[PDB]
């Protein structure tokens, strides 16, 4: 009559068994799904923690091929403004160049040149590009009289490949070129030198319009309705309804409201740890579920409430419940090493959320502080350098595990390899 | 016969500064001092000639902070001289080694060069003399046909202040300017925007030609003459004849040889720890001496049983050099900014730091992540940017000078007093 | 031009009190002393103007035991005046209570030298503060000397304390500025930040003796601030010359000190973490118990005798 549901296993209870392998670790595919509608080139998402994910680290996550969830320990307007920073991050073209209008007085243009130099001011009339003003133009009353007019401009259409533009610069013997839309409205500016140095991120997570992807977290408190609406107006790709107990009337209804009110935004629900919670979130319309309740030993949930589910079994039970639905599941918590990340994938996660592991990187919030001959971030977290090096080690280990199991892609890794149970 | 004990010698922990009447705030005291007969420093900091501490990149940062670095000698002659050159030739905004063409270069070849460097301009040189530029506009046979001629060139003579160049760029309504010398040989290329965005270092240690100062270490082995001559030709400001036992025929003669052979370069000898050694190096021609033999529980003491506690060594050397105009550099034994203050009051003109600068961003080595922490690899903790440590060390010195009522380094060295304390 | 050592300077662990012929029981000696020219105390104990030690509640306890508290200044002007007013208006019977002419419990308050100091002093004086403690890291300075002169001239009916100092010359300079007492202690402890960051300090036994000799015959008391770990050190500070001793951290965590009691891993702490230490009176009782035993050992019937007659031995490691 002691109601024991099952024996539940954690990461240290299992090991992956090697299997026949034909694909080298460097050649396997890591592509996966965050939600019904969002694909990621690596199975990594950064946690909505105020020591982990603000705009800077979310941009870096998306560039690596995963995604960041911006934390909610801030005001509604600030959270939306963080989303905007990610959506607006552009790698090559310059979007807000300093312009003037035909009516601008040359006296005023010369004042702006004390800060900006003489490389050239675009001339705009209500967003229409009508010419450019160069220092050479000032060298041979309003800029309408001296500007180079529209029929001498060399421009590139918005959306032209960055390598087609470099070629047009060369053909025209120019270094700068203005970018316009179909109607000759100014849309930005590219430089030959800036295309050359333009670091590129071929794995970047991008939406259908080419902008970096980003998520944002919300609770179930009173202003959630207004926070979700601001995040959606900002272009957020995914809203994470994120509480300690996702299997609750509060979370289920908030997920339903988001899915009914903002049908075209992805919604994740959690956290959960059972098949039946997974089903309740799927039926409320969740586009993905986040798995993890007291996943680690000695941890407030276990010590204070005696509640928790070992994370291997929690992941496997959720994956079993969702097989066929099309709803991914994100493993949240208990990963301390890359080996644990590989086990979470074989147990059925579609990808993995990391938190404190990313805290203290250069891209995470906080300022670098020198303490007692050591580096910390303060707001005392040790300073960890660039996020790319951590991502590289994690994905390096996952690739290694896919080599040992003969898994050529994530779908195989999630469904084919086997564990052994060990004793310690 | 009896036990030949010369004196009781005090180290840093034996003494404390007595507070005195003060009416100058720490932020307002002057830290200006002298490294040698002929080199002034804005802060009394010198980075040590260690191969985990001082190569070009850290030497540049030390000089910009107002101190100086001694480039280490654990490298070949030509490699050390190249490190000197990188410091002597470092510039904020002026691009050096620009891609050039000649008046005879064929326009076909220039177009091939533009594929990689783009347009915006190739200086035209004729055996190093500047005779024109080729811009994209000039292209819309040979470069001499199309090149903009010498008389259309806006040039500034090298060594002009940056704000001076920035003004000339403004006056002529251009973005690029060429830097020339007395005979119009090309020296570099500077742009308005590179100047507007360059960091200024108002405290920088510079020579009479405006170049960052640097020193370099030599020993007494057989290739020392060749090494010294290569360092002098590279522009080194000071040669440090740097051995474990400065009070020796080999160091004394090598200091003398440097002073007689290279009259125009400053020479430091060391290390020493007695009045007698101080007089011997000053008589040999040294422009400063370096103090420190076995300053605290180290290899010299354990292996050879040799050393002089550093407070007494500094004061003994200081008394021996009083009235000679030869400064002394305290080297070794400084754990804390408080020890640096004590060294100054005992008579040092400045302090050499070693391993405290190891592991900074600018120090040699690469950053690695190990166990959620950051180190420098070549096993040292990553300490962040040099300026943080420098700021801490000088902040403590400033506080000591506030406590002693010292308004400048000269007062700090000659007026304040110590108490001798017990082990208790 | 040799190394400029003014003297060897001794701390508490360098010295011990020598027993002397004795005729008084510890239970019978007198502990009365002065805090300032105009303020007597029945025990020579002062609580520190630290935000972990002295707000109104602990100043109230201190004055009831016969000492006094200095309210800290890490708070607003009106707030700190409110704290002073709480003490002056409080009636709990307590036979040793430190009280002013009106029968109100005595209290002090700290101020600095920054910009708003003039308004802070004015507000504290109007709340009834008994003594203004002009309290900086470096009392031998233009700022402190001029502020104590300003207080003595603008508010001649309050007592003024200046510090901290550690030399004879600084003591005489504060006295000439009008100080009613000086506070002694610059870098008193082995690992002061002062010592580590600036290399500055004076071991406290020598600092106290030097300041006491400089103020002899002036009527200006001196308060030993810092370095007291045990009641034995308190005894030594009195024999070196102090009139009373100021405790800080040792009072932190008492029931009366600021902060909120919290339970962490089966232990109690004050949540601002320091351990919970129970009632202040037990600590004050142990300290005065140790001092009474020292006076019994040395033969001192009262504080004047304890400050002037007994001798130290110097000891080694
Ligand atoms: N000196 C000069 C210049 C002259 N004469 O022409 C122009 N015409 C412009 O329109 N902008 C310019 O910035 C310049 C500068 C220039 C200097 C060096 C290079 Cl490599 C390229 C250009």
φ, ψ for residue B122, nearest 5 deg: -105, 120
If residue C212 lies in a helix (H) or strand (E), which one and from where to where?
Answer: helix C204-215
Give the C-alpha separation, B352 to B146, whole Å: 56
Tell me the CATH number for domain A1-91+200-365+386-424.
3.20.20.70
Fold of the domain spanning B93-199:
CBS-domain (3.10.580)
Q: Is B121 in the pocket of ligand 1 (CB under 6 A)?
A: yes
**Phi-psi group of B178: left, alpha or beta (phi > 0 → left; psi -120 to 50 → alpha; rest → beta):** beta
The residues facing A378 across adjacent strands are: A367
CA C210 to chain centre: 17
B350 is catalytic: no
The reply to whether B193 touches chain A by the CB within 8 Å rule is yes
Tell me the CATH number for domain A92-199.
3.10.580.10
Tell me the CATH number for domain B2-92+200-364+385-423.
3.20.20.70
The pairing of beta strand A288-291 with beta strand A329-332: parallel
B323 → chain C, closest CA residue = C1
Give the C-alpha separation, B47 to B62, whole Å: 7
CB B185 within 8 A of CB B130: yes
Give the C-alpha separation, C43 to C30, whole Å: 9
Measured in Å, residue B148 CA sits from the centre of ligand 1 at 9
Q: Is B101 in the pocket of ligand 1 (CB under 6 A)?
A: no
Give the C-alpha separation, A136 to C155, whole Å: 73
Q: DSSP state, C197? A: I
Compute the Cα dihedral for B352, B353, B355, B361 and give only its sign: negative
Q: Which residues of chain A make contact with B191, given a CB cutoff of 8 A?
A: 117
Measured in Å, residue A147 CA sits from the centre of ligand 1 at 18
C199 → chain B, closest CA residue = B338
Alpha-carbon distance values, B391 to A323, B199, B249, C154 (Å): 59, 17, 40, 41
CB B214 within 8 A of CB B88: yes
Give the C-alpha separation, C270 to C263, whole Å: 9
Give the C-alpha separation, A13 to A4, whole Å: 19
Q: DSSP state, B152? A: G
Distance of residue C229 Cα from the nearest chain B Cα, in angstroms? 14
Cα angle A380-A375-C192, degrees, rounded to a multiple of 5: 75
Alpha-carbon distance values, B165 to B9, B154, B313 (Å): 56, 10, 49
Tokens of A238: 């995914």
Give the C-alpha separation, B172 to A138, whole Å: 10
Asked if B422 lies within 8 A of C11 by C-beta distance, the reply is yes
Closest partner residue to C10 (CB to CB) among B341, B342, B422 is B422
- Which residues, including other chains, have CB under 8 Å from residue B255's CB and lie 6 or more apart? B241, B267, B269, B281, B284, B285, B286
- Which residues, including other chains, have CB under 8 Å from residue A340's CB and lie 6 or more apart? A11, A334
Give the C-alpha separation, B161 to B177, whole Å: 13
- Which residues, including other chains, have CB under 8 Å from residue B375's CB and lie 6 or more apart? B359, B367, B368, B381, B382
The reply to whether B373 touches chain A by the CB within 8 Å rule is yes
Query: What is the resolution in angstroms?
Result: 2.5
CB C192 within 8 A of CB C234: no
φ, ψ for residue A231, nearest 5 deg: -60, -40
CB B280 within 8 A of CB B307: no
Local structure of B54: helix, strand or coil: coil
3-state helix, strand, coil in chain C (%, to 5): 40, 20, 40
C15 → chain B, closest CA residue = B424
Q: Is B174 in the pocket of ligand 1 (CB under 6 A)?
A: yes
φ, ψ for residue B268, nearest 5 deg: -115, 140
**What's the number of CA atoms in the CB half-sphere (13 Å) around residue B60?**
17
b/e string for B325-364 if b means 16 or more Cβ within 10 A? ebbbbbbbbbebbbbbbbbbbbbbbbbbbbebbbbbbbbb
Distance of residue B339 Cα from the nearest chain C Cα, in angstroms? 6
Distance of residue A126 Cα from the nearest chain B Cα, in angstroms? 27
Q: Which of A174, A299, A305, A389 is catalytic?
A: A299
Tokens of C112: 């600095």
Give the C-alpha separation, B154 to B169, whole Å: 8
The reply to whether B333 touches chain C by the CB within 8 Å rule is no
Max Cα distance, chain C (Å): 64
Tokens of B295: 């300053």
The reply to whether C68 touches chain B by the CB within 8 Å rule is no
CB C90 within 8 A of CB C288: no
Alpha-carbon distance values, C18 to A61, B118, C301 (Å): 72, 90, 16
Q: Which long-range contacts (CB under 8 A, 24 or more apart) does B217-226 make?
A: B217/B49, B217/B70, B217/B71, B217/B72, B217/B73, B217/B242, B218/B73, B218/B242, B218/B254, B219/B73, B219/B243, B220/B250, B220/B251, B220/B254, B223/B77, B224/B254, B225/B257, B226/B77
Q: Is A136 in the pocket of ligand 1 (CB under 6 A)?
A: yes
Measured in Å, residue C295 CA sits from the centre of ligand 1 at 91
Binding residue numbers of A for Mg(2+): 54, 175
Per DSSP, the residues of C127-172 read HT-SEEEEE-S--SBHHHHHHHHHHHHH-TTSEEEEEEE-SHHHHH
- Residues of C annotated catalytic, as ranges: 192
Give the C-alpha separation, B282 to B255, whole Å: 10
User: Which superfamily does C2-258+279-317 belong to?
Assistant: Aldolase class I (3.20.20.70)
Q: Where are the beta strands (DSSP E) in B332-412?
A: 350-353, 366-369, 374-377, 380-381
After which residues do gaps appear in chain A, with C to N over 2.5 Å? 140, 379
Q: Is B144 in the pocket of ligand 1 (CB under 6 A)?
A: no
Tokens of B36: 């040698």
Helix/strand number for chain C, H first, E second: 10, 16
Determination technique used: X-ray
- Residue spans of the domains in chain A: they are 1-91+200-365+386-424, 92-199
The pairing of beta strand B350-353 with beta strand B328-331: parallel
Residue B173, classified by CB atoms within 10 Å of its CB into exposed (0-12), middle (13-18) or buried (19+), is middle
- Length of chain C equals 317
Residues A335, A396, A410, A284, Cα dihedral to 10° = 40
The pairing of beta strand C33-36 with beta strand A329-332: unpaired
Alpha-carbon distance values, B128 to B102, B141, B233 (Å): 9, 22, 21
Q: Which residues of chain B make contact with A383, given a CB cutoff of 8 A?
A: 374, 382, 384
Q: Where are the beta strands (DSSP E) in B321-395?
A: 328-331, 350-353, 366-369, 374-377, 380-381
After which residues do gaps appear in chain C, with C to N over 2.5 Å? 92, 272
- Which residues, including other chains, have CB under 8 Å from residue A239's CB and lie 6 or more apart? A215, A216, A217, A218, A228, A231, A232, A258, A262, A265, A266, A267, A268
The reply to whether A262 touches chain B by the CB within 8 Å rule is no
CB A163 within 8 A of CB A179: no
Distance of residue A118 Cα from the nearest chain B Cα, in angstroms? 6
Helix/strand number for chain B, H first, E second: 15, 21
Measured in Å, residue A270 CA sits from the centre of ligand 1 at 61
Asked if B193 lies within 8 A of A119 by C-beta distance, the reply is yes
Radius of gyration for the alpha carbons in chain C, expressed in angstroms and rounded: 19
The reply to whether B226 touches chain A by the CB within 8 Å rule is no
Tokens of A278: 């997974």
Q: DSSP state, A350? A: S
Q: Which of B233, B298, B388, B421 is catalytic?
A: B298
b/e string for C171-198 if b means 16 or more Cβ within 10 A? bbbbbebbbbbbbbbbbbbeebebbbbb
The reply to whether C210 touches chain B by the CB within 8 Å rule is no
Residue C288, classified by CB atoms within 10 Å of its CB into exposed (0-12), middle (13-18) or buried (19+), is buried
The residues facing C134 across adjacent strands are: C111, C162
CB C226 within 8 A of CB C190: no
The pairing of beta strand C15-17 with beta strand C5-9: unpaired
- Length of chain B equals 424
């Amino acid at each position: 009559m002691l109601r024991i549901s099952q024996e539940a296993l954690t990461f240290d209870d299992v090991l992956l068994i090697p299997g026949y392998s034909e694909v080298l670790p460097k050649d396997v595919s890591l592509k996966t799904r965050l939600t019904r509608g969002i694909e990621l080139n690596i199975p990594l998402v950064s946690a909505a923690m105020d020591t982990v994910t603000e705009a800077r680290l979310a941009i870096a996550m998306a560039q690596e091929g995963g995604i960041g969830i911006i934390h909610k320990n801030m005001g509604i307007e600030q959270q939306a403004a963080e989303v905007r920073k990610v959506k607006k991050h552009e790698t090559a073209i310059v979007r807000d160049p300093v312009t003037v209008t035909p009516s601008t007085k040359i006296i005023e243009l010369l004042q702006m040149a004390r800060e900006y130099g003489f490389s050239g001011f675009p001339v705009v009339e209500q967003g229409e590009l009508v010419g450019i003003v160069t220092g050479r133009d000032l060298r041979v009353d309003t800029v309408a009289a001296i500007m180079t007019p529209k029929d001498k401009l060399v421009t590139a259409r918005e959306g032209t490949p960055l390598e087609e533009m470099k070629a047009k610069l060369y053909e025209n013997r120019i270094e700068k070129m203005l970018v316009v839309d179909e109607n000759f409205y100014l849309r930005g500016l590219v430089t030959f030198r800036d295309i050359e140095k333009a670091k590129t991120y071929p794995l970047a997570s991008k939406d259908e319009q080419g902008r970096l992807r980003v998520g944002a977290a919300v609770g179930t408190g009173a202003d959630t309705g207004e926070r979700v609406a601001a995040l959606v107006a900002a272009g957020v790709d995914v809203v994470v309804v994120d509480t300690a107990h996702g299997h609750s009337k509060g979370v289920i209804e908030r997920v339903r409201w988001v899915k009914q009110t903002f049908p075209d935004v992805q919604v994740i629900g959690g956290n959960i740890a059972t098949a039946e919670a997974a089903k309740a979130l799927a039926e409320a319309g969740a586009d993905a579920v986040k798995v993890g309740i007291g996943p680690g030993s000695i941890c407030t949930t276990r010590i204070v409430a005696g509640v928790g589910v070992p994370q291997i079994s929690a992941i496997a039970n959720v994956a079993a419940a969702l097989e066929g639905t099309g709803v991914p599941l994100i493993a949240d918590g208990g990963i301390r090493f890359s080996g644990d990340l590989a086990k979470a994938m074989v147990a059925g996660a579609y990808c993995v959320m990391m938190g404190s592991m990313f805290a203290g990187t250069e891209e995470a919030p906080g300022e670098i502080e020198l303490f007692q001959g050591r580096s910390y971030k303060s707001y005392r977290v040790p300073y960890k350098g660039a996020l790319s090096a951590i991502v590289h080690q994690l994905m390096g280990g996952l690739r290694a595990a896919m080599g040992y199991t003969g898994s050529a892609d994530i779908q195989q890794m999630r469904t084919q390899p086997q564990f052994v149970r060990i004793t310690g």
